Coordinates of C-alpha atoms in Angstrom, one line a residue:
Chain A
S1399 CA 0.0 0.0 0.0
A1400 CA 2.8 2.7 0.3
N1401 CA 4.1 0.7 -2.7
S1402 CA 0.8 0.5 -4.5
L1403 CA 0.0 4.2 -3.6
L1404 CA 3.3 5.3 -5.2
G1405 CA 2.9 2.8 -8.2
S1406 CA -0.5 4.4 -9.1
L1407 CA 0.5 8.0 -9.4
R1408 CA 0.7 7.8 -13.1
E1409 CA -3.1 6.9 -13.4
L1410 CA -4.2 9.9 -11.2
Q1411 CA -6.2 12.5 -13.1
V1412 CA -5.2 15.8 -11.8
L1413 CA -6.8 19.1 -12.4
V1414 CA -5.0 22.4 -11.7
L1415 CA -8.1 24.7 -11.0
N1416 CA -6.3 28.1 -11.1
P1417 CA -5.8 31.0 -13.4
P1418 CA -3.5 30.7 -16.4
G1419 CA -0.1 32.1 -15.6
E1420 CA 3.3 31.2 -14.2
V1421 CA 2.1 29.4 -11.1
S1422 CA -0.3 27.1 -13.0
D1423 CA 2.5 26.5 -15.6
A1424 CA 5.1 25.5 -13.2
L1425 CA 2.7 23.2 -11.3
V1426 CA 1.4 21.4 -14.5
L1427 CA 5.0 21.0 -15.7
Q1428 CA 6.0 19.3 -12.3
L1429 CA 2.8 17.1 -12.4
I1430 CA 3.8 16.0 -15.9
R1431 CA 7.4 15.2 -14.8
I1432 CA 5.9 13.1 -11.9
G1433 CA 3.7 11.5 -14.6
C1434 CA 0.1 12.2 -13.7
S1435 CA -2.5 13.0 -16.3
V1436 CA -2.9 16.7 -15.8
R1437 CA -5.4 19.3 -17.0
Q1438 CA -5.6 23.0 -16.1
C1439 CA -9.0 24.7 -15.9
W1440 CA -10.2 28.3 -15.3
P1441 CA -12.9 29.7 -14.5
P1442 CA -14.3 27.0 -12.1
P1443 CA -17.1 25.0 -13.8
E1444 CA -20.2 23.7 -12.1
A1445 CA -19.5 19.9 -12.5
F1446 CA -16.4 18.2 -13.7
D1447 CA -17.3 16.6 -17.1
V1448 CA -14.5 14.0 -16.8
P1449 CA -13.5 12.1 -13.6
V1450 CA -11.0 14.0 -11.5
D1451 CA -8.8 12.3 -8.8
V1452 CA -6.9 15.4 -7.4
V1453 CA -7.5 19.1 -7.5
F1454 CA -4.9 21.8 -6.8
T1455 CA -6.5 25.2 -6.4
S1456 CA -5.6 28.6 -4.8
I1457 CA -7.5 30.7 -2.2
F1458 CA -9.6 33.5 -3.7
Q1459 CA -11.3 36.4 -2.0
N1460 CA -14.1 36.6 -4.6
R1461 CA -16.8 34.4 -6.2
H1462 CA -14.4 31.6 -7.3
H1463 CA -14.1 30.6 -3.7
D1464 CA -17.9 29.7 -3.5
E1465 CA -17.8 28.3 -6.8
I1466 CA -14.9 26.1 -6.2
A1467 CA -16.4 25.1 -2.8
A1468 CA -19.7 24.2 -4.3
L1469 CA -17.8 22.4 -7.2
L1470 CA -16.0 20.1 -4.8
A1471 CA -18.9 19.8 -2.3
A1472 CA -20.9 18.1 -4.9
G1473 CA -18.0 16.1 -6.3
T1474 CA -16.6 12.6 -5.6
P1475 CA -15.4 12.6 -2.0
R1476 CA -12.3 10.7 -3.0
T1477 CA -11.2 13.7 -4.9
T1478 CA -8.0 14.8 -3.1
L1479 CA -7.7 18.6 -2.4
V1480 CA -4.6 20.6 -2.3
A1481 CA -4.5 24.4 -1.8
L1482 CA -1.7 26.8 -2.8
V1483 CA -1.5 29.3 0.0
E1484 CA 0.3 32.6 0.1
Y1485 CA -0.9 34.2 3.3
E1486 CA -1.0 32.8 6.8
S1487 CA -3.5 35.2 8.2
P1488 CA -6.9 34.1 9.7
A1489 CA -9.3 34.8 6.8
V1490 CA -7.2 32.9 4.3
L1491 CA -6.5 30.1 6.7
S1492 CA -10.3 29.9 7.6
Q1493 CA -10.9 29.4 3.9
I1494 CA -8.5 26.5 3.8
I1495 CA -10.1 24.9 6.8
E1496 CA -13.6 25.4 5.3
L1497 CA -12.6 23.9 2.0
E1498 CA -11.2 20.9 4.2
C1499 CA -8.0 20.6 2.1
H1500 CA -6.0 17.3 2.5
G1501 CA -2.8 19.2 1.9
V1502 CA -1.3 22.8 1.3
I1503 CA 1.7 24.1 -0.6
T1504 CA 2.8 27.6 0.6
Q1505 CA 4.0 30.0 -2.1
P1506 CA 6.1 30.7 -3.8
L1507 CA 5.8 27.2 -5.2
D1508 CA 8.8 25.4 -6.6
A1509 CA 9.0 21.8 -8.0
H1510 CA 10.5 20.2 -4.8
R1511 CA 7.3 20.9 -2.8
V1512 CA 4.8 19.0 -5.1
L1513 CA 5.3 15.3 -4.9
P1514 CA 5.7 15.0 -1.0
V1515 CA 2.4 16.9 -0.6
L1516 CA 0.6 15.0 -3.4
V1517 CA 1.4 11.7 -1.8
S1518 CA 0.8 12.6 1.8
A1519 CA -2.5 14.4 0.8
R1520 CA -3.6 11.4 -1.4
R1521 CA -2.9 8.9 1.6
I1522 CA -5.0 11.2 3.7
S1523 CA -8.0 11.4 1.5
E1524 CA -8.1 7.7 0.8
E1525 CA -7.7 7.0 4.5
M1526 CA -10.7 9.3 5.2
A1527 CA -12.8 7.5 2.5
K1528 CA -11.9 4.1 3.9
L1529 CA -13.0 5.0 7.5
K1530 CA -16.3 6.3 6.2
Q1531 CA -16.8 3.0 4.2
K1532 CA -16.0 0.9 7.3
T1533 CA -18.4 3.2 9.4
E1534 CA -21.2 2.3 7.1
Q1535 CA -20.2 -1.4 6.8
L1536 CA -20.3 -1.6 10.6
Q1537 CA -23.5 0.2 10.9
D1538 CA -25.1 -2.3 8.6
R1539 CA -23.5 -5.2 10.4
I1540 CA -24.7 -4.3 13.8
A1541 CA -28.3 -4.0 12.4
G1542 CA -27.9 -7.3 10.5
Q1543 CA -26.5 -9.2 13.5
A1544 CA -29.5 -8.0 15.6
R1545 CA -32.1 -9.4 13.2
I1546 CA -30.2 -12.6 12.7
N1547 CA -30.3 -13.0 16.5
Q1548 CA -33.9 -12.0 17.0
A1549 CA -35.0 -14.3 14.2
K1550 CA -32.8 -17.1 15.9
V1551 CA -34.5 -16.5 19.3
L1552 CA -37.8 -16.6 17.4
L1553 CA -37.1 -20.1 15.8
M1554 CA -35.6 -21.4 19.1
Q1555 CA -38.6 -20.5 21.1
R1556 CA -41.1 -21.3 18.4
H1557 CA -39.9 -24.9 17.7
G1558 CA -38.1 -25.7 20.9
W1559 CA -34.7 -25.5 19.1
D1560 CA -31.4 -24.8 20.4
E1561 CA -29.1 -22.0 19.0
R1562 CA -27.3 -24.2 16.7
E1563 CA -30.6 -25.7 15.4
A1564 CA -31.8 -22.2 14.8
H1565 CA -28.6 -21.4 13.0
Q1566 CA -28.7 -24.5 10.8
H1567 CA -32.3 -23.8 9.8
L1568 CA -31.7 -20.1 8.8
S1569 CA -28.5 -21.1 6.8
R1570 CA -30.3 -24.0 5.0
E1571 CA -33.4 -21.9 4.0
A1572 CA -31.1 -19.0 3.1
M1573 CA -28.8 -21.2 1.0
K1574 CA -31.7 -22.9 -0.7
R1575 CA -33.6 -19.7 -1.8
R1576 CA -30.3 -18.1 -3.0
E1577 CA -30.7 -15.1 -0.7
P1578 CA -28.9 -13.5 2.3
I1579 CA -29.3 -15.0 5.8
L1580 CA -30.5 -11.6 6.8
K1581 CA -33.4 -11.7 4.2
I1582 CA -34.7 -14.9 5.8
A1583 CA -34.3 -13.4 9.2
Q1584 CA -36.2 -10.3 8.3
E1585 CA -38.9 -12.3 6.6
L1586 CA -39.4 -14.1 9.9
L1587 CA -39.6 -10.9 11.8
Chain B
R1098 CA -60.1 -62.4 51.6
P1099 CA -61.8 -60.2 49.0
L1100 CA -60.5 -57.0 50.5
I1101 CA -59.9 -53.7 48.7
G1102 CA -57.7 -51.1 50.3
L1103 CA -58.8 -47.5 49.5
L1104 CA -56.0 -44.9 49.7
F1105 CA -57.8 -41.6 49.4
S1106 CA -57.3 -38.5 51.5
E1107 CA -60.2 -37.4 53.9
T1108 CA -58.3 -34.3 54.9
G1109 CA -55.7 -32.1 53.2
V1110 CA -55.4 -30.1 49.9
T1111 CA -57.2 -32.5 47.6
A1112 CA -59.6 -33.9 50.2
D1113 CA -62.7 -32.9 48.2
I1114 CA -62.0 -34.7 45.0
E1115 CA -60.4 -37.8 46.9
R1116 CA -63.4 -38.2 49.1
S1117 CA -65.4 -38.1 45.8
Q1118 CA -63.1 -40.9 44.6
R1119 CA -63.6 -42.8 47.9
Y1120 CA -67.5 -42.8 47.6
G1121 CA -67.3 -43.7 43.8
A1122 CA -65.3 -46.8 44.8
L1123 CA -67.7 -47.6 47.8
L1124 CA -70.6 -47.2 45.5
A1125 CA -69.1 -49.9 43.2
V1126 CA -68.4 -52.2 46.1
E1127 CA -72.0 -52.1 47.1
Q1128 CA -73.2 -52.7 43.6
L1129 CA -70.8 -55.7 43.3
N1130 CA -72.0 -57.1 46.7
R1131 CA -75.6 -57.0 45.3
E1132 CA -74.2 -58.9 42.2
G1133 CA -72.9 -61.8 44.2
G1134 CA -69.7 -60.5 45.7
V1135 CA -66.7 -62.6 44.8
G1136 CA -67.7 -66.3 44.7
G1137 CA -70.4 -65.9 47.4
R1138 CA -68.0 -63.9 49.7
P1139 CA -68.8 -60.2 50.0
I1140 CA -66.1 -57.7 48.9
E1141 CA -64.8 -55.6 52.0
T1142 CA -62.9 -52.4 52.0
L1143 CA -60.4 -50.8 54.3
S1144 CA -59.8 -47.0 54.3
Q1145 CA -57.1 -44.8 55.8
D1146 CA -56.7 -41.0 55.5
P1147 CA -53.3 -40.0 54.1
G1148 CA -54.1 -36.3 54.2
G1149 CA -52.5 -35.6 50.9
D1150 CA -49.0 -36.3 52.2
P1151 CA -47.0 -38.6 50.0
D1152 CA -45.2 -40.2 53.0
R1153 CA -48.5 -41.0 54.7
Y1154 CA -49.6 -42.6 51.5
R1155 CA -46.6 -44.8 51.5
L1156 CA -47.2 -45.6 55.2
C1157 CA -50.8 -46.5 54.6
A1158 CA -50.0 -48.6 51.6
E1159 CA -47.3 -50.4 53.6
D1160 CA -49.7 -51.0 56.6
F1161 CA -52.4 -52.5 54.3
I1162 CA -50.0 -54.8 52.3
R1163 CA -47.9 -55.8 55.4
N1164 CA -50.4 -56.1 58.1
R1165 CA -53.8 -56.5 56.5
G1166 CA -52.9 -58.8 53.7
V1167 CA -54.3 -56.3 51.1
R1168 CA -53.5 -57.1 47.4
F1169 CA -55.9 -54.8 45.6
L1170 CA -55.8 -51.1 46.1
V1171 CA -57.8 -48.1 44.7
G1172 CA -56.3 -44.8 45.5
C1173 CA -53.9 -41.8 45.0
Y1174 CA -54.4 -38.5 43.3
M1175 CA -51.4 -36.0 43.1
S1176 CA -48.6 -37.7 41.2
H1177 CA -46.1 -37.7 43.8
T1178 CA -48.6 -39.7 46.0
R1179 CA -48.7 -42.2 43.3
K1180 CA -45.0 -42.4 43.1
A1181 CA -44.7 -42.9 46.8
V1182 CA -47.1 -45.9 46.8
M1183 CA -46.0 -47.5 43.4
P1184 CA -42.9 -49.3 44.6
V1185 CA -44.7 -50.9 47.6
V1186 CA -47.5 -52.4 45.4
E1187 CA -44.9 -53.6 42.8
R1188 CA -42.7 -55.2 45.6
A1189 CA -45.9 -57.0 47.0
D1190 CA -47.1 -58.1 43.6
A1191 CA -50.4 -56.2 44.4
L1192 CA -52.6 -54.3 41.9
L1193 CA -53.4 -50.5 42.4
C1194 CA -56.1 -48.8 40.3
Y1195 CA -55.3 -45.0 39.8
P1196 CA -58.5 -43.3 38.7
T1197 CA -56.7 -40.0 38.1
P1198 CA -55.6 -37.8 35.2
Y1199 CA -51.7 -37.6 35.0
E1200 CA -48.7 -36.5 33.2
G1201 CA -48.0 -39.8 31.3
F1202 CA -44.6 -41.3 30.8
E1203 CA -45.1 -44.3 33.2
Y1204 CA -45.6 -48.0 32.8
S1205 CA -46.2 -50.0 35.9
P1206 CA -47.2 -53.7 35.5
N1207 CA -49.1 -53.3 38.9
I1208 CA -51.0 -50.0 38.2
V1209 CA -54.3 -49.8 36.1
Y1210 CA -54.5 -46.3 34.9
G1211 CA -58.2 -45.2 34.9
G1212 CA -57.6 -41.5 34.2
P1213 CA -56.2 -39.9 31.0
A1214 CA -52.8 -39.5 29.9
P1215 CA -52.0 -36.0 28.1
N1216 CA -52.9 -37.3 24.6
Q1217 CA -56.4 -37.9 26.2
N1218 CA -57.1 -34.5 28.0
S1219 CA -54.4 -31.8 27.5
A1220 CA -53.9 -32.3 23.8
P1221 CA -57.5 -31.9 22.7
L1222 CA -57.9 -29.1 25.2
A1223 CA -54.8 -27.3 23.6
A1224 CA -56.4 -27.7 20.1
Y1225 CA -59.7 -26.3 21.5
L1226 CA -58.1 -23.3 23.2
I1227 CA -56.0 -22.3 20.3
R1228 CA -59.0 -22.7 18.0
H1229 CA -61.5 -20.5 20.1
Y1230 CA -59.5 -18.2 22.4
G1231 CA -56.9 -15.4 21.7
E1232 CA -53.3 -16.7 21.6
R1233 CA -51.9 -14.6 24.4
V1234 CA -52.1 -16.8 27.4
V1235 CA -51.1 -16.7 31.2
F1236 CA -50.5 -19.9 33.1
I1237 CA -51.2 -20.4 36.8
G1238 CA -50.6 -23.8 38.5
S1239 CA -49.9 -25.4 42.0
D1240 CA -46.1 -26.0 42.4
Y1241 CA -45.7 -29.8 42.1
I1242 CA -44.9 -32.1 39.2
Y1243 CA -48.2 -32.4 37.5
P1244 CA -49.0 -28.7 36.8
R1245 CA -45.3 -28.3 35.9
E1246 CA -45.3 -31.1 33.4
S1247 CA -48.6 -30.1 32.1
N1248 CA -47.3 -26.5 31.7
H1249 CA -44.2 -27.8 29.9
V1250 CA -46.3 -29.3 27.2
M1251 CA -48.9 -26.4 26.9
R1252 CA -46.0 -23.9 26.8
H1253 CA -44.5 -25.7 23.9
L1254 CA -47.9 -26.1 22.2
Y1255 CA -48.8 -22.5 22.3
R1256 CA -45.4 -21.3 21.0
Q1257 CA -45.7 -23.8 18.1
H1258 CA -49.0 -22.5 17.0
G1259 CA -48.2 -18.8 17.2
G1260 CA -49.3 -18.0 20.7
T1261 CA -47.4 -16.1 23.5
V1262 CA -47.2 -17.5 27.0
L1263 CA -47.0 -14.2 28.9
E1264 CA -46.5 -15.4 32.5
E1265 CA -46.1 -18.8 34.0
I1266 CA -47.1 -18.6 37.6
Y1267 CA -47.0 -21.2 40.4
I1268 CA -48.5 -21.1 44.0
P1269 CA -47.9 -23.4 46.8
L1270 CA -50.4 -26.3 47.3
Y1271 CA -52.1 -24.6 50.4
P1272 CA -51.6 -21.0 49.1
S1273 CA -51.7 -18.2 51.7
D1274 CA -53.8 -15.1 51.1
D1275 CA -50.8 -13.2 49.9
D1276 CA -49.8 -15.9 47.5
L1277 CA -53.2 -15.5 45.7
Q1278 CA -53.3 -11.7 45.7
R1279 CA -49.7 -11.6 44.4
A1280 CA -50.7 -14.3 41.7
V1281 CA -53.9 -12.5 40.8
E1282 CA -52.2 -9.2 40.3
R1283 CA -49.6 -10.7 38.0
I1284 CA -52.5 -12.4 36.0
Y1285 CA -54.3 -8.9 35.9
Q1286 CA -51.1 -7.1 34.7
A1287 CA -50.5 -9.5 31.9
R1288 CA -53.7 -8.7 30.1
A1289 CA -54.2 -12.2 28.7
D1290 CA -56.8 -13.4 26.5
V1291 CA -57.0 -16.8 28.4
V1292 CA -56.0 -18.1 31.7
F1293 CA -54.8 -21.8 31.7
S1294 CA -55.1 -23.1 35.2
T1295 CA -53.4 -26.1 36.7
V1296 CA -54.2 -25.1 40.3
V1297 CA -55.4 -28.2 42.2
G1298 CA -57.5 -28.6 45.3
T1299 CA -58.2 -26.2 48.1
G1300 CA -57.5 -22.6 47.0
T1301 CA -58.9 -23.3 43.6
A1302 CA -62.3 -21.5 44.4
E1303 CA -60.7 -18.5 46.1
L1304 CA -58.3 -18.2 43.2
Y1305 CA -61.2 -18.0 40.7
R1306 CA -63.1 -15.6 42.9
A1307 CA -59.9 -13.3 43.4
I1308 CA -59.5 -13.3 39.6
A1309 CA -63.2 -12.4 39.3
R1310 CA -63.1 -9.5 41.8
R1311 CA -59.6 -8.2 40.6
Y1312 CA -60.9 -7.7 37.0
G1313 CA -63.2 -4.6 36.6
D1314 CA -66.0 -7.1 36.7
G1315 CA -65.7 -7.0 33.0
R1316 CA -65.1 -9.3 30.1
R1317 CA -62.2 -11.0 32.1
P1318 CA -60.3 -13.5 30.1
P1319 CA -61.9 -16.9 30.6
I1320 CA -60.2 -19.5 32.8
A1321 CA -59.5 -22.9 31.1
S1322 CA -58.4 -25.6 33.5
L1323 CA -57.1 -29.1 33.2
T1324 CA -57.5 -29.7 36.9
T1325 CA -60.7 -27.9 38.3
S1326 CA -63.4 -30.4 39.0
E1327 CA -67.1 -30.2 39.9
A1328 CA -66.0 -30.3 43.5
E1329 CA -64.3 -26.9 43.1
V1330 CA -67.1 -25.3 41.0
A1331 CA -69.7 -26.0 43.7
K1332 CA -67.6 -23.7 46.0
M1333 CA -67.8 -20.9 43.4
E1334 CA -70.4 -18.1 43.2
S1335 CA -72.6 -18.4 40.2
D1336 CA -71.1 -15.4 38.3
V1337 CA -67.4 -16.5 39.2
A1338 CA -67.8 -20.0 37.9
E1339 CA -69.8 -18.9 34.6
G1340 CA -68.0 -19.3 31.3
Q1341 CA -65.1 -21.1 32.9
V1342 CA -63.6 -24.1 30.8
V1343 CA -62.9 -27.6 32.1
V1344 CA -62.0 -31.0 30.6
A1345 CA -62.8 -34.6 31.7
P1346 CA -64.0 -38.0 30.5
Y1347 CA -67.1 -37.5 32.5
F1348 CA -69.5 -34.6 33.6
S1349 CA -72.6 -35.1 35.7
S1350 CA -74.7 -33.3 33.0
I1351 CA -74.0 -36.1 30.4
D1352 CA -77.4 -36.9 28.6
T1353 CA -77.5 -40.7 28.7
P1354 CA -79.4 -43.4 30.8
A1355 CA -76.0 -44.6 31.9
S1356 CA -75.0 -41.2 33.2
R1357 CA -78.5 -40.6 34.6
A1358 CA -78.2 -43.9 36.5
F1359 CA -74.9 -42.9 38.1
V1360 CA -76.1 -39.4 39.3
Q1361 CA -79.1 -41.0 40.9
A1362 CA -76.9 -43.7 42.6
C1363 CA -74.5 -41.1 43.7
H1364 CA -77.1 -38.8 45.0
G1365 CA -78.7 -41.6 47.1
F1366 CA -75.4 -42.8 48.7
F1367 CA -72.9 -40.0 48.9
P1368 CA -72.7 -37.8 51.8
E1369 CA -73.5 -34.0 51.8
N1370 CA -69.9 -33.0 51.5
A1371 CA -69.0 -35.3 48.6
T1372 CA -69.7 -33.9 45.3
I1373 CA -69.9 -36.0 42.1
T1374 CA -66.8 -35.6 40.0
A1375 CA -65.2 -37.2 37.0
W1376 CA -62.8 -39.0 39.3
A1377 CA -65.7 -40.5 41.3
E1378 CA -66.8 -41.7 38.0
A1379 CA -63.5 -43.3 37.3
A1380 CA -63.1 -44.8 40.8
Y1381 CA -66.6 -46.3 40.3
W1382 CA -65.8 -48.0 36.8
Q1383 CA -62.4 -49.2 38.0
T1384 CA -63.6 -50.6 41.1
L1385 CA -66.5 -52.3 39.2
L1386 CA -64.1 -53.7 36.7
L1387 CA -62.0 -55.3 39.6
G1388 CA -65.1 -57.0 40.9
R1389 CA -66.3 -58.5 37.6
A1390 CA -62.8 -59.6 36.7
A1391 CA -62.7 -61.4 40.1
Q1392 CA -66.2 -62.8 39.6
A1393 CA -64.9 -64.2 36.2
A1394 CA -61.8 -65.6 37.7
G1395 CA -63.7 -67.1 40.6
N1396 CA -61.0 -66.0 43.0
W1397 CA -59.1 -63.0 44.5
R1398 CA -55.6 -63.9 43.2
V1399 CA -54.0 -60.9 41.6
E1400 CA -52.6 -63.1 38.7
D1401 CA -56.1 -64.6 38.1
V1402 CA -58.0 -61.3 38.6
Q1403 CA -55.6 -59.4 36.4
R1404 CA -55.7 -61.6 33.4
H1405 CA -59.5 -61.2 33.2
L1406 CA -59.1 -57.4 33.4
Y1407 CA -58.0 -56.6 29.7
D1408 CA -60.9 -58.5 28.4
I1409 CA -63.8 -56.8 30.1
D1410 CA -64.8 -53.6 28.2
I1411 CA -67.3 -52.0 30.7
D1412 CA -70.3 -49.8 30.3
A1413 CA -69.4 -46.9 32.4
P1414 CA -71.3 -43.8 33.1
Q1415 CA -69.0 -41.9 30.8
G1416 CA -69.5 -44.3 28.0
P1417 CA -67.7 -47.5 27.1
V1418 CA -64.2 -48.2 28.6
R1419 CA -61.5 -50.8 28.4
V1420 CA -58.0 -51.3 29.7
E1421 CA -55.3 -52.1 27.3
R1422 CA -53.1 -55.0 28.1
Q1423 CA -50.1 -53.3 26.3
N1424 CA -49.8 -50.4 28.6
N1425 CA -52.2 -50.7 31.6
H1426 CA -53.8 -47.4 30.5
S1427 CA -57.5 -47.1 29.5
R1428 CA -59.6 -46.1 26.4
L1429 CA -61.5 -43.1 27.7
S1430 CA -63.9 -40.6 26.4
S1431 CA -62.9 -37.0 26.4
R1432 CA -65.2 -34.0 27.0
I1433 CA -64.6 -30.2 27.0
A1434 CA -67.3 -28.3 29.0
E1435 CA -68.2 -24.6 29.5
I1436 CA -70.0 -23.8 32.8
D1437 CA -73.3 -21.9 32.3
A1438 CA -74.8 -19.3 34.6
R1439 CA -76.5 -22.0 36.9
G1440 CA -73.3 -23.8 37.6
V1441 CA -73.9 -26.6 35.2
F1442 CA -71.3 -28.1 32.9
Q1443 CA -72.3 -27.8 29.1
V1444 CA -70.3 -30.1 26.9
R1445 CA -69.1 -28.2 24.0
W1446 CA -66.9 -30.8 22.3
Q1447 CA -66.5 -34.6 22.6
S1448 CA -64.0 -36.8 21.0
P1449 CA -66.0 -38.8 18.2
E1450 CA -64.8 -42.0 20.0
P1451 CA -62.8 -43.0 23.2
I1452 CA -59.3 -42.0 22.8
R1453 CA -56.5 -44.7 23.0
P1454 CA -53.9 -44.0 25.5
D1455 CA -50.3 -43.2 24.5
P1456 CA -48.7 -42.1 27.8
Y1457 CA -45.2 -41.6 26.1
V1458 CA -46.1 -39.5 23.1
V1459 CA -43.8 -36.5 23.1
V1460 CA -45.2 -34.6 19.9
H1461 CA -48.8 -34.0 20.3
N1462 CA -50.1 -33.4 16.8
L1463 CA -53.0 -30.9 17.1
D1464 CA -54.2 -31.5 13.6
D1465 CA -55.6 -34.8 14.8
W1466 CA -58.4 -32.8 16.3
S1467 CA -59.3 -30.5 13.4
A1468 CA -62.1 -32.3 12.0
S1469 CA -64.1 -32.9 15.2
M1470 CA -63.8 -29.4 16.5
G1471 CA -64.1 -27.2 13.4

């Protein structure tokens, strides 16, 4: 996984969401040396058009901030976010916090700062997405377990069966009707 | 000596039904003595009062067999009193007639079972109850083996047929006042559709009266019992007793000449404090069978009398009965009755024919009873 993360950088689709100019140019050139697929866009659109894995943007005190914010709010949560920052003062930093960046690059940008930030930010966003996915799986699991257990008590008590017998019956019907054990359980309940 | 030992309590928790059994047995002796006794010699009886105590039953059985030469006994009611006597009769090669309903699961070469096993009373009653009453039930029984075994089956039957057994309550055999009040409050708090009682003897009447008063004298759940007899219903106010449900092979209201003849015979012979019950009926027919088997054998030898027992199908007050040689149990009628407002037992269902006994059946198939009840 550090190994697979590093090995898949050349398949990432990176978008430099920033005005045309020297900064965008230097950033796009360093993302092409690293080997990512890189596009540059400006003014911020309303939806992406093509799948995007990582966005680099700057912090604007104007309507592109809200556009960018809305653009990524509606977007795929696994989209990694990196902000180019030139001020350390509270309104600018609050903007970074509200956008919920996964990484930052303070200006002036230079090639040495890019790869370490892209990798650490990508690990970060992927780890966030995984914890959220585990959270849903576990929520579903706790609920499932409960209905398998209440259905088992139901069979036990209905038929004068032990736990093992109730379990064998659920499994058997389940795997004879090509459906989840949970469906059988919920049918009973 | 043609001497029958009668082991029925006169005092104690089940004194009423057992006095009833004693007089039923005495009624038979009297009739047998008018039919020629046993080979010219009159049939004699010997009675002792064990007072519902299993150890006193054993001691009375032992006195009779050891010191009085008794080899033929009629007696016992509560199952542990039967268990206490059984070994004494088996070691003496004696014969005991048990004219009492019981939990089943017993075979004794020396016991002639004149009362129904669970396939003959509880099963039909379970089918009936699940058929006509709501499926939320509350159980209340006396704390000894029979109500407990009887609840063990009924609990399983209700759960198998989509019912809920809300509370399963037990009270001591001579239940204090507090015992009753606590029990009735639980019954009242469960809001059951039906009350299945297995309470036996003294305290039955008070129990049914307390359920009555407790409820807001309003469409209480009906009480269905496996144990309540005519002796308990006579101690109940008319309105308490009304609509209660009861099961037995015989009811004094049966509409036949044979039943009519038994009522009349009991009315002119039984004391004032001895009500006719289904167990007086069973003591009567069993005691009658003993006498006729002895008359057919020409002697009073257990071996000779016993042989002639399985071959004599009798015309009992309940209808026709016989004892099966394979298991010492009997083929018995089975009636389910609802008590009307004047304290009379109205038979609501009857098995089309006498039910053959199967004391060891574990799975009671309620479908057996679909045709005759619906």
